[PDB]
């Protein structure tokens, strides 16, 4: 219960099929609020907050521990194990997509399916590989994030949301601004330093790759990369949704696509 309490674990819904909804960067579990009504009636929905979420006591964010994705996988597995979940479908936005991938390699039996939203195994460019970002441009962003966090949020949130959906821009900004600035920077460094390309072939559960248009964080070719390199049966859903946070900006359409992927 103490981790379950610390990370605001919530189990809701009247169904028996277990569905884990795992928020990503800059949000908390409330990013799923508008998706939830579409699943509460026929799934048992598990939600939690990543340790870096603005909604979690920043005392739990231990900079000596959370230096890679692996301790975040530990937290997810502990939660699922504590709850007695021996199989689930798992939806991971942003960094939670990579967390779910790693968890699935550790525990191949735990996941029936992974649904990946706004996922990338690597943000940085490399030889054969377009991640979308150059090392140099990214140091400039880290400097701005350190120099003026509130301003960085206000410039970043419209790019992340992408589509002109002011309510979703304000909502993402709200949860980014709830994160302690040095946590946000450290998490961002952690993930820009991450490269999951080498482990994708180890995954054996089926993955549904949800890819929006003009995703600031994820070039189209990255979705194709995941499809070609994840080791199990993969399916790309090319969503008629613009931007990196489709659960915030287009929830109805996102929820219908999720239901389709789950029923596949
Ligand atoms: C894209 C980005 C992010 N994004 C992340 C960082 C960590 C985990 C997930 C993300 C994510 O976008 O899903 C953070 C800071 C700066 C920038 N940027 O555009 O320079």
List key phrases describing it:
41% helix, alpha/beta, AB_hydrolase_1, monomer, binds 2-[(2-methyl-3-nitrophenyl)amino]benzoic acid, 264 residues, seven-stranded mixed β-sheet, 16% strand, Rossmann fold
The radius of gyration is 17 Å
CATH architecture classification name: 3-Layer(aba) Sandwich
Oligomeric organization of the protein chains: monomer
> Rough shape?
globular
As for the number of domains, it is 1
Measured by DSSP, the beta-strand proportion falls in: 15-25%
Kindly report the name of the CATH homologous superfamily.
Alpha/Beta hydrolase fold, catalytic domain
* SSE topology string: HEEEHEHEHHHHEHEHH
Q: Briefly note the CATH topology name.
A: Rossmann fold
Q: Number of DSSP strands? A: 7
Q: Main sheet?
A: 7 strands, mixed
Number of helical elements? 10
PDB class: plant protein
Keywords: alpha/beta hydrolase, plant protein
Assembly: monomeric
Entry title: Crystal Structure of DAD2 in complex with 2-(2-methyl-3-nitroanilino)benzoic acid
Explain what you see.
The chain starts with a helix and ends with a helix. With 264 residues, it is α/β, with parallel strands linked by helices. A seven-stranded mixed beta sheet has the order 1-3-2-4-5-6-7, with helices on both faces. The chain has one domain: 3-Layer(aba) Sandwich (Rossmann fold), CATH 3.40.50. The chain contains ten helices and seven strands. Bound molecules: 2-[(2-methyl-3-nitrophenyl)amino]benzoic acid. The site of 2-[(2-methyl-3-nitrophenyl)amino]benzoic acid (BNY) has 11 residues, from helix 4 and helix 7.
């Amino acid at each position: 219960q103490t981790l379950l309490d610390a990370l605001n674990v919530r189990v809701v819904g009247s169904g028996e099929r277990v569905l884990v909804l795992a928020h990503g960067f800059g949000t908390d579990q409330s990013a799923w609020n508008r998706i939830l009504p579409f699943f509460l009636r026929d799934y048992r929905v598990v939600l939690y907050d990543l340790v870096c979420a603005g909604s979690v006591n920043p005392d739990f964010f231990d900079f000596r521990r959370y230096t890679t994705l692996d301790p975040y996988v530990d937290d997810l597995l502990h939660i699922l194990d504590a709850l007695g979940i021996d199989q689930c479908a798992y939806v991971g936005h942003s960094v939670s997509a990579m967390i779910g991938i790693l968890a699935s390699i550790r525990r191949p039996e735990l996941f029936s399916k992974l649904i990946l939203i706004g996922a990338s195994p690597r943000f940085l460019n490399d030889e054969d590989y377009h991640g979308g970002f150059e090392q140099g441009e990214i140091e400039k962003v880290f400097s701005a994030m350190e120099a003026n966090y509130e301003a960085w949020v206000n410039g970043f949130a419209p790019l992340a949301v992408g589509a002109d959906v002011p309510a979703a821009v304000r909502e993402f900004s709200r949860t980014l601004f709830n994160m302690r600035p040095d946590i946000t920077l450290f998490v961002s460094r952690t993930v820009f330093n991450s490269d999951m390309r080498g482990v994708l072939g180890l995954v054996k559960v089926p993955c549904h790759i949800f890819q929006t248009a003009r995703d600031h964080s994820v070039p189209a070719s990255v979705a194709t990369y995941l499809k070609n390199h994840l080791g199990g049966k993969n399916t790309v859903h090319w969503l008629n949704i613009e931007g990196h946070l489709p659960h915030l900006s287009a929830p109805t359409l996102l929820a219908q696509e999720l239901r389709r992927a789950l029923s596949h």
